[PDB]
Amino acid sequence: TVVFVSGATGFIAQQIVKTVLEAGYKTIGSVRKGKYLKSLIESAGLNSNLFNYVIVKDIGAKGAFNEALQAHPEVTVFLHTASIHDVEKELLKPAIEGTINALNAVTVYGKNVQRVVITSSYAAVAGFANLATPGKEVNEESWNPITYEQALENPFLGYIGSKKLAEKTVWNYIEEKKPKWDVTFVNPAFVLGPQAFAVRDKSKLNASNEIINSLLTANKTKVEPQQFVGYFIDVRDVAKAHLIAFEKNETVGQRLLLANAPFSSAGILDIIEKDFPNLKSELPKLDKSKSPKFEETESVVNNEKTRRILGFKFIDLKKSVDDTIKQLV
Ligand SMILES: NC(=O)C1=CN([C@@H]2O[C@H](COP(=O)(O)OP(=O)(O)OC[C@H]3O[C@@H](n4cnc5c(N)ncnc54)[C@H](OP(=O)(O)O)[C@@H]3O)[C@@H](O)[C@H]2O)C=CC1
Structure with a gap:
């Protein structure tokens, strides 16, 4: 199989490029830096003969992937990942057109x-x-x-x-x-x-x-930290779900709801204080009033269908936060 991935230099996409190579599949990523990512995989110890790249300046422009799909007609999987506070110019139309420019x-x-x-x-x-x-x-x-x-x-x-x-x-x-x-x-x-x-x-x-x-x-x-509520998911679980989305035949036409458990900025902070006591002088005190309550905005996610189709156990919040903090020292 040959797996194409748009916007390979992204957060999820880099994890997508990684776990695919660990499954032995070929990979061809898009880039706005192509050596930044190829030096990354080879040094990472991964089996590094399954990845090349393409240069795509913009996704919201017409025919953004034509010369990419005309230089390599071998691709058989298309992973369209590339797509907050902006500047307030235009965010809607380029998002729908960027996808249409790929379809x-x-x-x-x-x-x-x-x-x-x-x-x-x-x-x-x-x-x-x-x-x-x-x-x-x-x-x-x-x-x-x-x-x-x-x-x-x-x-x-x-x-x-x-x-x-x-x-x-x-x-x-x-x-x-x-x-x-x-x-x-x-x-x-x-x-x-x-x-x-x-x-x-x-x-x-x-x-x-x-x-x-x-x-x-x-x-x-x-800066007083903006607090959040909602459902989380580990980037490695999303990467593993992107493989099942093309490797399995039952995922066709399915909206894989990639959500684990609820979270909160206060709940994430408690994990950091315990598992990283050397940071207790660098962690702030969150305001109990600025904290959004969960049972007020978020619905009850019923992704029982997705977990059963994916079949693997997701990464818990503690491991997700611990692995995150471990990288940033
Ligand atoms: N919590 C999350 O991460 C969530 C993720 N998602 C979706 O998952 C996807 C992955 O996002 P994530 O990795 O977290 O975020 P990143 O900002 O790290 O990923 C952005 C990626 O899109 C590319 N990109 C953005 N704008 C353009 C453009 N105009 N032209 C070309 N390439 C562009 C970037 O290329 P480059 O960086 O080289 O410029 C980069 O590879 C997104 O589409 C996001 O909406 C869904 C819900 C929440």
Whole structure:
């Protein structure tokens, strides 16, 4: 098998590129640095003859992957991973077009592709903010009731909208165009965990791991840490689920809800104080009033279907946080 991965230099994608190579599959990643990632795998001890790369400056531009799928027609898996606070220019339309630019380039040029795995999100599963359904039931088939108009009112709700709607463009495409490849959706919740190989900037991680990292850099930046609630998932569990999304035949047309257990910025902090006492002078005191309560925004995730299909045991929060902190010293 030959697995293509868009935006390979990303947080989840680097873990995706890693666990695939550990399964012996070939890999071909996209890059905006190609030697930054190839020097990373070989030095990591991985079996390093299963990876090359392509250069793609932008995903939201038309035909972004055509010359990538016209230089290598051998690919048979497409892992579309590349897709918070922005600048408030435009976040919705490039997110839906960036996906469409790939569904138009995988169909028009990549015909050796059989399975496509679109990395979506839990934001396309349950509602946020004014559409919060606290205490209510959500599962693989549930959908965020947010609309395009109700989105991009916030860099937060806009990201929530841009992720719920970009998955819709795949659902509309597979029926409007009726392609020859099969689709699978991996819907990761709040992804935590350590980098695939090596951290590059210890002061700022990805937007998701800053949930952990802000607790460390708070006393340096003198920034009161923004607290969060919701469901977490370890980046290694998401990486393993992306393989099952194309290696297994029962994941076809399934929205793999990649959520473990609830979490909280306060709950994550307690793990760091116990397992890393040398940091007790670097960890802050969280305000009990600034803390969002769980039973108020988040629904009840019913991913019983996904856990049964994945079949493996996920990484607990303690191991996820411990492995995360171990990298940043
Ligand atoms: N907690 C989480 O991590 C969550 C993850 N997800 C989804 O999973 C995916 C992985 O995100 P994650 O790894 O955590 O975050 P990162 O920011 O680390 O990943 C971003 C990736 O997308 C690429 N990219 C972004 N914008 C562009 C662009 N305009 N043109 C080309 N490439 C671009 C980046 O390439 P480069 O870095 O080289 O610029 C990078 O590889 C995302 O699509 C995210 O929405 C879903 C829900 C939550």
